[PDB]
Design a protein around this nucleic acid. Structure first.
Ligand SMILES: [Mg+2]
Ligand SMILES: [Mg+2]
Ligand SMILES: [Mg+2]
Ligand SMILES: [Mg+2]
Ligand SMILES: [Mg+2]
Ligand SMILES: [Mg+2]
Ligand SMILES: [Mg+2]
Ligand SMILES: [Mg+2]
Ligand SMILES: [Mg+2]
Ligand SMILES: [Mg+2]
Ligand SMILES: [Mg+2]
Ligand SMILES: [Mg+2]
Ligand SMILES: [Mg+2]
Lengths: 190, 106, 172, 136, 197
RNA sequence: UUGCUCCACACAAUAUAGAUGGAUACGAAUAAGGCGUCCUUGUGGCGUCGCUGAACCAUAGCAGGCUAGCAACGGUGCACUUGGCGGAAAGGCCUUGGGUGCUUGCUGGCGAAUUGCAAUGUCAUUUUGCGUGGGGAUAAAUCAUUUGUAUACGACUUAGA
RNA sequence: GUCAAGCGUUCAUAGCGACAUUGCUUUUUGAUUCUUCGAUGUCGGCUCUUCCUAUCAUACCGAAGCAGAAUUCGGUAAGCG
């Protein structure tokens, strides 16, 4: 169809600075800073009144309009992640063998070590990505809390811990074992 | 001055040809700076010299010339067709010829 | 088909001694030249009446121009065509300044989108949509908003020289 | 704490946009866009420069940085009134773009004796310039 | 028009460039192509990688040293593309190929010479925005070419010195252009403006 | 039986995938940049440019002679020199200083003809050779003999004043 | 391969699948006598190399009427047996 103009809104709240040269977006707030290279898209950003940035596609087909609301959602994720921050909570699910996860250092690389998953002698190792801060819940039994600015970094680190603890050669309908994400939320949320 | 050019530089490109049969009696010339058949009508009838060197001296010269003239245009892009008194030797495909401004009109 | 022309063709079905003055059928024909328009006349009346060219007569062919060729008109084109596996009716909307230059677009659009040739297509009706909000299609309702303006990003400038010296730009 | 989003400027296909025909019987004449037919094709009108009111692709057309107030669908008499009242032809001729069009018309029109004069004058200007480079 | 023409291969589409260069070589023009590691081919990287593996898998069965020679460097992929556009088995097409030099990066002499582009072959002019393309450097290091990191080290060195050149060249063209504007309003320079100069 | 190489200029032969003013150097982006400028030195403000190199530089003089001055202290060529940078294939780029011409920036004086109405009308750059007068240098390999870490033969690997 | 009446304790499609229907192979077997009668040495074996994938095993997976063990259906895959 090639719609003439599709357009989206981005609400920049009171503490946030958004800076967009060519298609590289820099979002600065109370929690740090974030950068995305959006040069694969071809949208056009325009600043209206310092609390609002439009993003537009001119003469765009169905897939090109489709990526426009993606670009809105990604910058809003950056804005949320530098104002409220991002926080994931994972619980350990085990039947018989308890799962031992402690935050570990190997050559200054800050891994996550998982011993005794299903009684495996194999120690599993997940590296902590930068920005993600691993926490172990007090007054919740067997909960790991991943916190940081990027929802891309926090959720992929929470994805990597689930993916390393998969169950092999068993019926996974019964062998329900692993570390699963229980909550996707913010840090400064109430 | 440093320049004494009183001709226009050209290139001997090809014989007149189909896909699989060439005609050596007609040669196709790319005049430099001409990009249109309407531009190339200026050069029709102008004399072309292919100036080349040898080792045997014949008449007080080691430089020999092949003389011919533009006859018509070729294609859409300023290539012209030229005919020579003896046909160009086909090792000169890509060689430079000289398109003189005579017989002049404007 | 460099540009289509609208013709009126009037045909008669030749007078007999029983019937002098037969009934004068008129069509509006989009065609390239008058040869095709008379051929398109007899092809269409042979779908409607017991008449053919060997028993009929062309009494007038006149070329109809557009009354206001420099006014932008929303048209509604009714078209019937044959696909590879059946016959379909179809309604499309073309915004254009001529009827014969909307029929250019329609024959271009049905070939591009439905692989329908000239021989497959019958133009049922071209009418100009007189009032806005009787415009049905959204691809032409785009261009009917108040104070419409759009950029043209990524300008590619043609060159006549095989070499450039600048690493060009696409601003516009 | 100022948000800095880059401008991303663009000349718009709009009513009142002054254009320059680059292909056709005009080929270098100004015209104004009157109504937008679709995405590649507009209705233009060039009444001061003698361009017929016509439906044209934007591929024979360059947008120019000039825009004047013009109602949508305005006729050829109305366009010429708003053209002169907005004084497009002197707004266009002051631009660097029109000067380079006019200069290359002038350079192509020079006779051989005038080309000699350009050589003579340029060596005079070069003598003044190259002296001025060494002094400062 | 120049005795040799030096093409920057960055941002060019490979077959649109190779058809331009092949016609120029057979017309008697000498061409050197630099930066062949930053050529472009249309289509996704995986798309174009399967194309090499299909080419990589054909070779003479009874003697693999007689078959197609699967040349891996980006300048040789571009040389392969330009072959097959030239009658390379005839003396005319051999002479055309002698008029061609192709390099990765910008080596000497050519690091201090002017680089042209071919806008018939330019990616940003010819491909639709939103399409996917591959860079020939990343394709070549996946099919077995060993010197991407060396050329990237040498080009980064090359761009450091070349920026120092242009930083001096900007300063000189300040001094020149401010003198020419001050030598304007002269009765010569009003008389040169009359003649269109 | 004065052999070899380098430097320069003197002449022969050799040819030419094709001189005929100049290959005239940022990088990156292209839904963005370039240049100028300002400050708080930024993913900054302001101005301005593109819409092709149709540019820019060069470019006048018996293929460019001989000669007179004016202005300016500029431009350019050749040879010496000074210092720096360049290893991707550097083999070039930028400098200091003197000598040496030329200068059409400006104004003069003399020459040109008969190549006869046009004939590339010969002006380039390779290889070599011979000659001159200036510098430099003062070996190896192979056969034949030998070894057996090698070997059909060659080849290999060793040894011998 | 499609469709799904039914089988599969209920439940068409975990695994199956009638009556129909649409294709693939040239390694099975059938049709031309196209080439060979101034002769292309006729089967099997041994030896030895390479190729295909329509995958038996091995690597990694998805599904189950997969609790485990063992199976079965399916994917990538001819690298290696
Ligand atoms: Mg698994
Ligand atoms: Mg099991
Ligand atoms: Mg040819
Ligand atoms: Mg021909
Ligand atoms: Mg360059
Ligand atoms: Mg290898
Ligand atoms: Mg001079
Ligand atoms: Mg026989
Ligand atoms: Mg398979
Ligand atoms: Mg398997
Ligand atoms: Mg399997
Ligand atoms: Mg294989
Ligand atoms: Mg194998």
């Amino acid at each position: 169809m090639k719609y003439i103009q599709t357009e989206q809104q981005i609400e920049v709240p009171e503490g946030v600075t958004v800076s967009i040269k060519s298609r590289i977006v820099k979002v600065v707030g109370p929690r740090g800073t974030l950068t995305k290279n959006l040069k694969h898209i071809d949208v056009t950003f325009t600043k209206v009144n310092n609390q609002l940035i439009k993003v537009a596609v001119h003469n765009g087909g169905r897939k090109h309009v489709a990526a426009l609301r993606t670009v809105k959602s990604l910058v809003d994720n950056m804005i949320t992640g530098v104002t409220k921050g991002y926080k994931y909570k994972m619980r350990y699910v085990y039947a018989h063998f308890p799962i031992n996860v402690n935050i570990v250092e190997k050559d200054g690389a800050k891994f996550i070590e998982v011993r005794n998953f299903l009684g495996d002698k194999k120690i599993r190792n997940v590296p902590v990505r930068d920005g993600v801060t691993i926490e172990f819940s007090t007054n919740v039994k067997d909960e790991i809390v991943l916190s940081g600015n990027s929802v891309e970094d926090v959720s992929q680190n929470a994805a990597d811990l689930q993916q390393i603890c998969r169950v092999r050669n068993k019926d996974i309908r019964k062998f329900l074992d692993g570390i699963y994400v229980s909550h996707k939320g913010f840090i400064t949320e109430d | 001055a440093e320049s004494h050019r009183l001709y226009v530089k050209g290139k001997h490109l090809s014989y007149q040809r189909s896909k699989r049969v060439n005609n050596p009696n007609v040669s196709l010339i790319k005049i430099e700076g001409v990009a249109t058949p309407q531009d190339a009508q200026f050069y029709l009838g102008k004399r072309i010299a292919y100036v080349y060197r040898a080792s045997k001296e014949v008449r007080g010269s080691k430089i020999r010339v092949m003389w011919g003239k533009v006859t018509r245009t070729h294609g859409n892009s300023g290539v012209v067709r030229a005919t020579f008194r003896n046909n160009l030797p086909a090792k000169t495909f890509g060689a430079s010829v000289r398109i003189f401004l005579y017989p002049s009109n404007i | 088909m460099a540009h289509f022309k609208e013709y009126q063709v009037i045909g008669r079905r030749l007078p007999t001694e029983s019937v002098p003055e037969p009934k004068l059928f008129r069509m509006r024909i989009f065609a390239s030249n008058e040869v095709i328009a008379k051929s398109r006349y007899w092809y269409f009346l042979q779908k409607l009446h017991k008449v053919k060219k060997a028993s009929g007569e062309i009494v007038s062919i006149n070329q109809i121009n557009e009354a206001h060729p420099t006014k932008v008109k929303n048209f509604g084109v009714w078209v019937r065509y044959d696909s590879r596996s059946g016959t379909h009716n179809m309604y499309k909307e073309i915004r254009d300044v001529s009827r014969v230059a909307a029929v250019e677009t329609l024959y271009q659009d049905m070939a591009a989108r439905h692989r329908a040739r000239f021989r497959s297509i019958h133009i049922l009706k071209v009418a100009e949509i007189e009032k806005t909000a009787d415009v049905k299609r959204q691809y032409v309702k785009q261009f009917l908003t108040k104070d419409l303006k759009f950029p043209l990003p990524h300008r590619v400038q043609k060159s006549t020289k095989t070499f450039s010296y600048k690493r060009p730009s696409t601003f516009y | 704490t100022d948000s800095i989003v880059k401008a991303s400027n663009w000349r718009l296909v709009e009513v009142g946009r002054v254009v320059l025909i680059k292909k056709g019987q005009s080929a270098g004449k100004l015209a104004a866009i009157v109504e937008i037919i679709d995405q590649k094709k507009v209705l233009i009108d060039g009444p001061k420069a003698g361009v017929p009111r016509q439906a044209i692709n934007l591929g024979q057309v360059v947008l120019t940085p000039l825009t004047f107030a013009l109602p949508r669908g305005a006729r050829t008499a109305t366009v010429s009134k708003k053209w002169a009242a907005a004084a497009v032809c002197e707004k266009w001729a002051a631009s660097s773009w029109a000067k380079k069009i006019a200069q290359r018309e002038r350079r192509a029109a020079l006779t051989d004796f005038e080309r000699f004069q350009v050589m003579v004058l340029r060596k005079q200007k070069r003598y003044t310039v190259k002296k001025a480079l060494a002094k400062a | 028009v120049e005795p040799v023409v030096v093409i920057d291969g960055k941002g060019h589409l490979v077959g649109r460039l190779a058809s331009v260069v092949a016609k120029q070589l057979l017309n008697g023009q000498k061409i050197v192509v630099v930066r062949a590691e930053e050529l472009n081919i249309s289509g996704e990287f995986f798309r174009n990688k399967l194309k090499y593996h299909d080419f990589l898998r054909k070779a003479t069965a009874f003697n693999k040293t007689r078959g197609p020679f699967h040349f891996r460097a980006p300048s040789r992929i571009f040389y392969k593309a330009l072959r097959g556009m030239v009658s390379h088995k005839t003396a005319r097409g051999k002479a055309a190929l002698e008029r061609l030099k192709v390099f990765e990066g910008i080596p000497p002499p050519y690091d201090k010479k002017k680089r042209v582009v071919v806008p018939q072959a330019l990616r940003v002019l010819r491909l639709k925005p939103g399409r996917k393309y591959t860079t020939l450097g990343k394709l070549s290091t996946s099919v077995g070419w060993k010197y991407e990191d060396v050329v990237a080290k040498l080009e980064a060195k090359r761009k450091v010195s070349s920026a120092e050149y242009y930083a001096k060249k900007r300063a000189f063209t300040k001094k020149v252009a401010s003198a020419n504007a001050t030598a304007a309003e002269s009765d010569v320079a009003k008389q040169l403006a009359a003649l269109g100069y």
